[PDB]
Design a protein around this ligand. Structure first.
Ligand SMILES: NC(=O)C1=CN([C@@H]2O[C@H](COP(=O)(O)OP(=O)(O)OC[C@H]3O[C@@H](n4cnc5c(N)ncnc54)[C@H](OP(=O)(O)O)[C@@H]3O)[C@@H](O)[C@H]2O)C=CC1
Ligand SMILES: NC(=O)C1=CN([C@@H]2O[C@H](COP(=O)(O)OP(=O)(O)OC[C@H]3O[C@@H](n4cnc5c(N)ncnc54)[C@H](OP(=O)(O)O)[C@@H]3O)[C@@H](O)[C@H]2O)C=CC1
Ligand SMILES: O=P(O)(O)Cc1ccc2ccccc2n1
Ligand SMILES: O=P(O)(O)Cc1ccc2ccccc2n1
Lengths: 400, 398
């Protein structure tokens, strides 16, 4: 039995991982569940999986959870707050930690798992978007195993050779026959929109993916290719890839999830249904395999597969992400933070669709921060970048 | 580096192998070259790669090679005949043997390499199409490592987990998370031809593949999907795959080379340019990589990738091969041999395009031979199958 901690058990990734546990009771035992405020979901999960521990970040949520579990005869011990959440990530008997908390709040619990030398099933975006140097340095020091859960990074990982898989972050691509990492993205709803029409796209239009049904913020990041820009940042950290070892391709059908190019001409790819239980089950069972509940991909029921090079005039956020990487973790943290603000402003109809890239750039230009040296420095860059972005939004929404 | 014997050095695969060595002179030493009758090409290869031995199967050819190397000042030792070729495959100091002799002549030298526990870069079709049971048994015994060179099988191998790659031929697919092997094929030039028109296709039409330029025999095998049927037979042996663990898919663009389906939903695939140096260089360098001279696949200059299920009314030879596998090595050997006869007859304008599958079936129906127990037994089945086929052709053309 692999013993697990699930950080962010009540969200989308957490629920999908619990479905894999559900399919494989003989392979995985839930030791600890951690969430924020979803008491109702958390009760159900505690009843089904009988974790030794459950933690809620919010103290009033933990209190309610403590009492309901007692009445429903649950023996799970209820804890509260961030220290408790990091402790679950570092439990002696825990083998793997599903790192699936959203936002900067995912940082310290994910780091706790890394410092404890655990296998980390990495979902939280902020980990490598904002703390990529700090976290890869930390995994190298503890020899923690990272296994990326994100569909694209997981596809890359599966398409990579065994010496890289087992030394992830540290191994040399070149020495292992790898010439580049091919990161694929859908191109969003506006792949073919006349460029001059982008300024007038509405929130509803940007969120109407042709081939996806997801939350508004991630849907906008798909439309700007900010989503791929952030995954570019993560992949360079995760896979130890230089700028010339990265290729971003638009692949509108999203059937190929990403690819790896080798020295002999070979390209290895992972394909599948768009269901997160595939990459989650891959990371949970690695180096073996487990049923995930995902139906086999039917090749006779596909759109024709196509590819194209991103136009940075169409996707300036993609180019900003790549440029941000070269400026360091202060810049990537600032871009991620500014983008949360400007995307929310766009969705609230305070700015135009094209003002996301323009204001993201303006924030980066106005920032003057030193390379972060610890998580606390990153949190400070993030706070400051948000304030700079909010003030840019207000300037635009008010004045000139 | 690695010491190589190249069986069939003067042919297409042999020449591509030597091009990989040309790109990687520090990683590969050519110890022995073995060929048939192509003395001119053989001299040039001995002068470039400085092997210790050169073998011509044909004795007149060996005598002529010796005279030319002498004139040219080379001290490469010249040998002749079948035992010599097997001896090269078995040399104590060699690491890898490129098995690229064409036809049943490739069998004994390939077996010699297997019995010697060598790493076998396997590119002879008869080895597994005709001798799959005998050769996989021999591989388990000697612990020889097979590395398939054929593009589809190599793509599958690249897409399989490490415990299968090591242990190739005896590993359990299901235990290693593999649901099935997805063997991809172009569908040939008549993929969209009305079925009514197949009976009147000419040899020049059958050989005119929209995306290929190969020899006539294999171009016809692509048109009938016999080529994929034979690869289906090899894949079942190579990958220890039952019928239910095999899927054949038409992929017209031939960009994906083949795939492997996994328990969690994942499908891994290998893609690349249509250039045999890629899989050759993969097998030579494994488990590492080398430069092959092949240019990087440009994803911005591709046709859209499509897939389709093969229709056995359009491709009866594919179904015959799948069925032949279940009947055993006598049936697979008979089919391969009959198909050589019928394709040649088609190309000679003695029979129609659709007679190839019809007479292939007819031969198998006529034959009941028992499972071969040794290479002599398969040679015997092969010889009898050809005679049945030639008579079927003569009857038809009569
Ligand atoms: N969704 C996807 O397909 C993918 C997402 N990702 C990344 O994975 C992460 C998780 O995504 P997803 O599951 O969709 O996000 P959700 O918003 O669905 O879930 C977030 C989880 O984090 C919990 N949480 C929030 N704040 C805290 C905190 N302070 N302490 C402890 N738990 C907290 C939430 O608890 P509660 O709800 O109870 O308040 C919830 O369980 C994100 O960073 C995302 O970018 C990566 C790859 C794919
Ligand atoms: N071509 C391809 O893309 C692929 C082919 N295959 C298979 O690989 C094998 C080789 O194919 P290919 O390279 O195309 O074939 P060729 O016909 O081009 O080459 C055959 C080689 O075998 C030699 N040969 C023939 N008879 C003997 C013999 N009795 N003893 C020693 N050598 C002999 C030839 O010598 P010589 O010319 O001097 O007389 C030549 O060097 C075949 O079984 C084929 O089906 C598999 C994967 C890919
Ligand atoms: O690749 P993107 O645009 O960043 C996000 C995205 C969009 C559509 C998708 C459709 C199926 C699967 C994954 C997808 N991912
Ligand atoms: O797949 P098939 O039809 O058996 C043989 C075939 C035909 C065309 C091809 C084009 C590019 C690469 C491989 C090919 N192979």
């Amino acid at each position: 039995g692999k013993q697990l901690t699930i950080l962010g058990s009540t969200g989308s990734i957490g629920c999908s991982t619990l479905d894999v546990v559900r399919h494989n009771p003989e392979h995985f035992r839930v030791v600890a569940l951690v969430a924020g405020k979803n008491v109702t979901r958390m009760v159900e999960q505690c009843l089904e999986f009988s974790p030794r521990y459950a933690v809620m970040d919010d103290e009033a949520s933990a209190k309610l959870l403590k009492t309901m579990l007692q009445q429903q005869g649950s023996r799970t011990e209820v804890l509260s707050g961030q220290q408790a959440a990091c402790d679950m990530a570092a439990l002696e008997d825990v083998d793997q930690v599903m790192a699936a908390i959203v936002g900067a709040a995912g940082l310290l619990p994910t780091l706790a798992a890394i410092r404890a030398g655990k296998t980390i099933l990495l979902a939280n975006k902020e980990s490598l978007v904002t703390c990529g140097r700090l976290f890869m340095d930390a995994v190298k020091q503890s020899k923690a195993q990272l296994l990326p859960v994100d569909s694209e990074h997981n596809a890359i990982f599966q398409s990579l050779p065994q010496p890289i898989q087992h030394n992830l972050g540290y191994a040399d691509l070149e020495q292992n026959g790898v010439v580049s990492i091919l990161l694929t993205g859908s191109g969003g709803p506006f792949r073919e929109t006349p460029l001059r029409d982008l300024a007038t796209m509405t929130p509803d239009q940007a969120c109407r993916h042709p081939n996806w049904s997801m939350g508004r913020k991630i849907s906008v990041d798909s439309a700007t290719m900010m989503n791929k820009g952030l995954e570019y940042i993560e992949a360079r950290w995760l896979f130890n890839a230089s700028a010339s070892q990265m290729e971003v391709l638009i692949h509108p059908q999203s059937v190929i999830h990403s690819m790896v190019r080798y020295q002999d001409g070979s390209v290895l790819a992972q394909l599948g249904e768009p269901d997160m239980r595939t990459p989650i089950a891959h990371t949970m069972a690695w180096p073996n395999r487990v049923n995930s509940g995902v139906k086999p991909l039917d090749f006779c029921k596909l759109s024709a597969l196509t590819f194209a090079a991103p136009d940075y005039d169409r996707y300036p956020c993609l180019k900003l992400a790549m440029e941000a990487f070269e400026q360091g973790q202060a810049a990537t943290t600032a871009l991620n933070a500014a983008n949360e603000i400007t995307v929310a402003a766009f969705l609230a109809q305070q700015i135009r669709f094209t003002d996301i890239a323009a204001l993201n750039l303006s924030v980066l230009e106005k920032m003057d921060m030193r390379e972060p040296q610890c998580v606390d420095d990153v949190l400070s860059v993030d706070a400051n970048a948000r304030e700079v972005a909010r003030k840019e939004v207000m300037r635009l929404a008010s004045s000139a």
